[PDB]
Amino acid sequence: GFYNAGDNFELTPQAAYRIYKQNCDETFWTRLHNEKTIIHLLPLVEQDPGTNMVLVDDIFRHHLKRFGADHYIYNAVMQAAAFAKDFPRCEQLLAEMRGLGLEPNAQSYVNMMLGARLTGKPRDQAEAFFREGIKTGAISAVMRLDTEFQMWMNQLERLGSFKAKVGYLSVNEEGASPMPRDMWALWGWHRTEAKFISRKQMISEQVQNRVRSGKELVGTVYQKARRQPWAKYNGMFPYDYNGPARRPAASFVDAPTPTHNAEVCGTAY
Amino acid sequence: SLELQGMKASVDIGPNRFDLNEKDLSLDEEEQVEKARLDNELMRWRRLQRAQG
Amino acid sequence: PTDYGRGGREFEYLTVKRGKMLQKPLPRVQYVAEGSKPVWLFKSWHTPLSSPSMWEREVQYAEHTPEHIGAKRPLAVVAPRTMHRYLFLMHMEKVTITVSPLLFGYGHTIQKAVLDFYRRAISARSPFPKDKVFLFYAIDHITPRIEVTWLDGTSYVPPVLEGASSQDLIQMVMEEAWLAADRMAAEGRVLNPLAIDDYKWDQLVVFKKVRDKEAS
Amino acid sequence: RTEAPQWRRKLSEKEWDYYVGQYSAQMKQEEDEIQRRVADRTCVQEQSTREVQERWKRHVV
Amino acid sequence: LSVRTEDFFSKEAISHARRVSWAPHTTEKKQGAFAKLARSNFSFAQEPYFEEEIEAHRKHHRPDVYIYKYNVSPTHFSLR
Amino acid sequence: QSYLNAVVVSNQVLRAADDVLIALSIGEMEAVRQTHGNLIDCVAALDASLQWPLFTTIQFLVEEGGLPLGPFPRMSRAYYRLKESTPVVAHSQLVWRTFELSRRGFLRDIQRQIAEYTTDPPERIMAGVTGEKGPLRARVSGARLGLQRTPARIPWTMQGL
Numbered sequence: 001g002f003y004n005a006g007d008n009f010e011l012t013p014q015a016a017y018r019i020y021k022q023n024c025d026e027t028f029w030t031r032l033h034n035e036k037t038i039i040h041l042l043p044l045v046e047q048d049p050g051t052n053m054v055l056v057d058d059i060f061r062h063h064l065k066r067f068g069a070d071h072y073i074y075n076a077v078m079q080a081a082a083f084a085k086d087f088p089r090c091e092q093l094l095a096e097m098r099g100l101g102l103e104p105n106a107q108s109y110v111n112m113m114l115g116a117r118l119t120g121k122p123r124d125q126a127e128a129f130f131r132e133g134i135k136t137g138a139i140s141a142v143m144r145l146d147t148e149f150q151m152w153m154n155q156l157e158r159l160g161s162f163k164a165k166v167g168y169l170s171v172n173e174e175g176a177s178p179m180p181r182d183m184w185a186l187w188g189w190h191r192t193e194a195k196f197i198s199r200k201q202m203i204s205e206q207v208q209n210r211v212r213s214g215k216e217l218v219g220t221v222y223q224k225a226r227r228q229p230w231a232k233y234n235g236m237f238p239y240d241y242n243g244p245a246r247r248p249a250a251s252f253v254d255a256p257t258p259t260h261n262a263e264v265c266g267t268a269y
Numbered sequence: 270s271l272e273l274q275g276m277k278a279s280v281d282i283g284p285n286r287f288d289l290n291e292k293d294l295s296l297d298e299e300e301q302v303e304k305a306r307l308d309n310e311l312m313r314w315r316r317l318q319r320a321q322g
Numbered sequence: 323p324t325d326y327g328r329g330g331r332e333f334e335y336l337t338v339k340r341g342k343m344l345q346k347p348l349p350r351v352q353y354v355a356e357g358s359k360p361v362w363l364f365k366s367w368h369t370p371l372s373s374p375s376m377w378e379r380e381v382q383y384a385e386h387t388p389e390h391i392g393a394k395r396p397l398a399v400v401a402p403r404t405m406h407r408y409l410f411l412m413h414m415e416k417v418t419i420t421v422s423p424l425l426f427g428y429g430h431t432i433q434k435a436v437l438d439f440y441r442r443a444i445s446a447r448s449p450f451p452k453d454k455v456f457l458f459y460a461i462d463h464i465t466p467r468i469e470v471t472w473l474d475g476t477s478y479v480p481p482v483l484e485g486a487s488s489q490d491l492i493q494m495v496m497e498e499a500w501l502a503a504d505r506m507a508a509e510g511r512v513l514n515p516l517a518i519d520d521y522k523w524d525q526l527v528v529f530k531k532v533r534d535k536e537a538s
Numbered sequence: 539r540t541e542a543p544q545w546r547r548k549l550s551e552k553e554w555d556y557y558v559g560q561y562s563a564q565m566k567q568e569e570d571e572i573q574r575r576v577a578d579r580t581c582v583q584e585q586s587t588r589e590v591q592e593r594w595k596r597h598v599v
Numbered sequence: 600l601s602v603r604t605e606d607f608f609s610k611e612a613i614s615h616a617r618r619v620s621w622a623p624h625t626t627e628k629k630q631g632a633f634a635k636l637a638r639s640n641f642s643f644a645q646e647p648y649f650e651e652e653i654e655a656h657r658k659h660h661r662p663d664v665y666i667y668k669y670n671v672s673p674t675h676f677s678l679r
Numbered sequence: 680q681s682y683l684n685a686v687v688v689s690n691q692v693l694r695a696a697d698d699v700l701i702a703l704s705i706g707e708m709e710a711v712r713q714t715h716g717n718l719i720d721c722v723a724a725l726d727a728s729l730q731w732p733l734f735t736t737i738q739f740l741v742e743e744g745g746l747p748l749g750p751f752p753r754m755s756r757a758y759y760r761l762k763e764s765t766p767v768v769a770h771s772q773l774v775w776r777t778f779e780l781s782r783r784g785f786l787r788d789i790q791r792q793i794a795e796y797t798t799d800p801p802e803r804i805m806a807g808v809t810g811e812k813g814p815l816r817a818r819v820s821g822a823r824l825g826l827q828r829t830p831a832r833i834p835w836t837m838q839g840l
Contacts, residue, residue: 001828008678009828010668018558019565019824025598026562027591028569036822042667053752060750061723065716066594068794069747071806077749079666089752096747100787106662110671134390142397142656147353147385151673159666168676169667178545189648192835202826203568205833207575208840209816214486215837216810216817218493221298221403225305226836230645231313255556260548261541283520284452286445291532292489293442294525298403306644366624367632377655380620401655430582465804481808484581484801501659561825568826587799593709663807663814670813678830679819 005175007185007195012268016040017055024062031070034063038076042083043269046162049084056080069100075107082115083161090115109133110152117156126153162269172269190229355385361395373515374398374504393508406496407489408525409446411454412516413503416471417443422460431484436466438488439495447521470495472502474509682732689732692721696740703789708796711789719750726754734761744786 001011011019020037023029038059044052056077063073074097081089090112097104112129130149133139141148160167175181180196187195197205209216239245279285296304327334361382369375377398379386386396411417419440426433443455460466468491471477480494507513549557577584611628619625634640652658657674664670670677695718702710722740725733730753737758740746748755761767798806808815820829 001825008830009825011824011828015558015561016824018554019561022555022558023562023565025595026566027588027595028566028573030821032818032821033824036824039668057750057752058723061719064747064750064790065712065719067797068790070794074749083667086752089749092752092755093749096749099745100747100790107664110664114666139662140656140660141388141390142654143353143386144384144389148673151353155671155673155676159669159671168669176546187831188834189646190835192838193831193833195831197831199568199826202829202831203571203575204840205831205838206572206820206823206826206829207579208833208837209820210572210576211579211581212485212837212840213805213815213817214483214490216812216815217481217483217486217808218490219811220301220405220493222296222301222305222405223834223836224650225302225644226308227650227834228305228309228644228646228648229835230647231309232835233316252556252560255543256550256552258541258543258547258553259550261544263548264544264546265548283524284450286451286524287441288445289524289528291528293408293445294529294532295407296405301403301405364624365620365622367627367629368624371629371632376619380622397656399654400652465800481804483805483808497655497659501656504655564827565823565825569823572823582801584799584801590708590797594712597709597713658811661809661811661813663809663818665814677813679814 002174002176002178003180005173007175007180007182011040013040013042013044014268020059029066031063031067031072034059034067035072035076038073038080042080043162045080046083049086053080053084053086069097069102071097071102071105071108074102075105075111078108078111079114082111082118085115085119087115087119087121104133104136104138106133106138109138113152114156117153118161123153172267174267174269176267189227190232190234192229192232353385354383358383358385360384372402374500374507377401377504387508391505391509393505394510395508397508398504401497401500406493409443409492410496410499410516411443411446411448411451411470413499413506413513414470414472415454417455418469418471419443419455419457419466420460420464420468421457421466422463424460424463425466432466432482432486435486435488435491436468436482439468439491442488442492447516447519449519449521468495470499472499472506473511473513474502474506476502478502684728685732688721688725688728689736692718692725692736692740695721699789700785703785708793712793715789715793722746722751722754726751729753729757734758734767740786743783745784745790746786747790 001009001015003009016037017040020033023033038056041052041055041059045056060073060077063070067073074093078090078093081093094104094108094112097108109129109132113126116126116129127149130139130152131145134141134145134148139148143151158168160170162169162172164170183196184191185195187193361384363375363378363380363382365376365380377400379396379399382396387393388397419436421433421436421440426437440455440457444451446455448454466482467479468482469477469479478495478498480491480498482491503513610626613628619629630641654674657672661672664672665679668679670679695714699711699714699718702714725736734757737746737754741748741758748758805815805817808818810816813819816832823829
């Protein structure tokens with residue numbers, strides 16, 4: 001794994017697949033982990049479907065064995081098929097969802113639209129999928145159906161694909177670096193809302209997410225104004241004056257001797 | 270009877286509302302921003318008083 | 323990023339720079355057909371601010387009207403930012419709350435949240451709130467839930483999760499009720515606007531008490 | 539004085555296994571602590587799910 | 600030039616975002632409506648920060664649609 | 680040789696299906712899951728080996744029970760090709776004629792049962808829920824392949840628990 005251009009840490013698709021392989025049966029593993037692994041593998045599926053669709057199918061089989069059928073896994077696999085340019089497989093996955101009873105989801109319909117656009121199917125098919133979704137109720141349109149479909153198509157065109165020429169997904173350049181260029185980078189309005197936080201603070205944040213889940217459903221100007229950090233003690237601390245505490249790093253003394261060191265690791269994305 | 274004894278619980282004119290306290294009054298954007306400002310100023314005041322003490 | 327300038331006390335009240343001025347074209351509105359004739363809504367302070375017409379969009383394009391929900395006009399873009407601490411159920415035809423006494427015995431916070439929501443609903447602003455508010459105990463001890471059905475026949479369920487208070491539930495319900503009212507108005511069905519009434523006076527007394535307490 | 543492990547280097551099978559094992563150990567520690575803290579917060583009784591996961595792990599190996 | 604009512608009366612200094620509309624009828628202040636109804640007469644923080652607003656209908660019901668690793672919506676993208 | 684291997688694999692699949700049926704009859708979720716995993720492993724072995732008795736076993740698994748073919752794209756392709764092939768049509772016609780003269784979905788059910796037995800009530804209630812800033816943070820960060828990669832999204836106002 002490495003920090004990309006945005007100082008965000010991302011795992012290589014191969015690393016994610018190997019983590020999945022080694023943690024298939026662990027107690028903490030979940031359908032969310034399976035779908036995240038499929039997500040990580042998606043770029044490789046697009047680059048070479050003939051060698052990575054087998055891995056995606058293995059993940060799908062493991063998911064069926066452990067957790068059975070789920071909207072998350074079906075959506076992930078149909079998105080992988082769409083990236084691999086397998087429209088018949090996307091349709092087969094949708095049909096399997098309908099047969100098993102998993103109500104088709106807005107994500108599934110968007111996956112169908114993406115597959116149609118990537119494979120080059122006429123826009124009539126994408127319009128039909130969007131209309132089916134809106135009738136089912138998975139998708140809700142505030143504008144007219146034609147305008148909503150145009151907006152979705154424009155968003156998908158902006159995204160593009162991995163082999164495409166123009167598109168956000170069509171940009172493989174990344175500022176790879178073991179460490180972020182600015183460790184005090186902010187994600188919010190104050191140094192309290194720093195992008196990088198200690199492991200214990202992150203664990204507390206995860207517990208907050210899983211426990212106080214209701215608060216995420218509401219938002220009010222009272223909270224928005226309360227968040228303004230104009231009375232948040234923008235002062236200094238002894239660690240600010242001296243330096244970060246000298247915490248020893250994680251030394252891999254037992255690591256095996258490095259082989260293929262002369263060989264560079266090509267970008268996976 | 271017991272019904273006669275309890276006949277005064279109900280409100281003859283209006284409905285039988287279970288509670289109506291200060292917490293039930295709604296507040297618009299202006300009132301909400303005022304309350305947020307007051308809370309932030311109170312936090313700053315507590316911090317300053319603690320520093321003084 | 324290019325609009326940044328100088329420091330605070332070094333602000334640029336006047337700038338002089340040699341060069342050929344470049345008038346970059348102004349942004350063009352998107353997702354609008356060509357040659358389409360929009361509909362204009364004359365906003366004025368004579369219309370009360372609370373009315374959804376003020377929050378509606380002035381220039382209305384036919385392609386912005388959702389014709390499959392029955393709407394004739396496009397949906398309002400802005401929404402009121404009020405924090406609803408009470409419940410106003412005039413625009414909703416029915417409310418059903420399913421609760422579990424066994425889960426209450428277990429002692430979950432969702433139980434208290436739903437019970438307080440029911441109490442505030444039956445003490446809501448609409449006349450005779452008990453007429454529209456109904457409570458059903460868990461016939462099969464299922465997870466508690468809330469369902470609000472509007473005059474249009476549509477229904478909404480506020481996702482009840484841990485760390486959710488009756489205040490948050492009422493805020494969500496009232497926001498969705500305002501959205502449903504806007505949708506119905508766009509559809510073209512008259513919707514009885516609210517006006518000061520007995521509940522308004524009952525709120526006035528407590529407001530005056532709060533004012534007196536603060537003054538003291 | 540000695541060859542350094544280049545950061546942008548290919549990894550053999552053994553190196554892959556070692557690094558993935560270290561990462562999985564960190565994941566296990568984080569997940570265990572998160573699970574224990576949420577259980578202490580005792581949102582609901584998840585003993586059934588804990589037993590289900592333990593049963594699956596035991597049956598697999 | 601000469602004297603004018605434009606010189607006489609001063610408009611409200613309100614930002615574009617806050618302004619509900621630019622219509623001549625809405626040119627006046629909001630409190631004017633209350634003042635007329637009652638037939639009577641009557642400051643940004645140090646760090647004023649606002650999180651970007653979203654259309655009401657879209658924000659209250661945001662579809663849980665995602666792409667490779669970015670949330671995709673008819674109006675907004677994001678990272679997740 | 681190849682026919683013998685196909686017969687052996689078909690017999691293994693049949694034994695796995697019998698184990699699944701026995702587990703369903705008993706009503707034990709552990710045995711149900713183990714037998715389902717064994718069946719899926721047998722089908723994966725079928726796919727690997729393929730890379731007629733197998734076709735009949737697949738017909739039984741897809742008709743008597745509902746087997747999702749998503750994980751087995753090549754298997755689905757082969758099944759559809761064989762169904763389109765004439766001999767299958769002749770066999771179906773003969774079966775229909777015999778039935779006229781004479782004149783289960785267990786896989787889908789077990790998949791639903793294991794899904795329900797695995798999903799916890801908190802996850803079930805949290806599923807299909809969206810907030811006013813996007814999908815639930817719990818759903819987005821549930822994978823949590825590492826806190827080193829998990830981003831921070833908690834405002835300082837709500838940061839304190």
